[PDB]
Amino acid sequence: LSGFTVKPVATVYRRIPNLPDCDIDNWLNNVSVPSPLNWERRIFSNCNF
């Protein structure tokens, strides 16, 4: 008779990232807090967060 099979679910996904981490928490938790008059700006580009 016809061969009986099953339908698998809950697949797995693996892939190596090509870009490093943005590391935003490291700069947000800095020991130096600038005054409201300074309001230092930091730009991030080409990273994964």
């Binding site: 061969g3 698998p8 797995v12 892939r15 080409n46």
Partner: protein, 98 residues
Amino acid sequence: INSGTTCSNDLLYSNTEISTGVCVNYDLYGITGQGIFKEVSAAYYNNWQNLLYDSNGNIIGFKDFLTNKTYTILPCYSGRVSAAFYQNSSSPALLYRN
């Protein structure tokens, strides 16, 4: 928005859990397939090596980069039953081989 390369890794990292015993699908480093997984102790994997192949070209083992654990992939069951039926019987006799 919807451009550049600065993306997020939240959707593709929902579960990141590997089962051992059940039949499931897998997309590992671009290789797509389906089968069952089993735990084994392997020490022949190098720093840049993540998959294991054979002479025929199929995948037989791999190693997870998030936990440093090796796994072996085995094909899942796909068989066929034999039905022995008489002339005017009500239900045939079933035989599952092996």
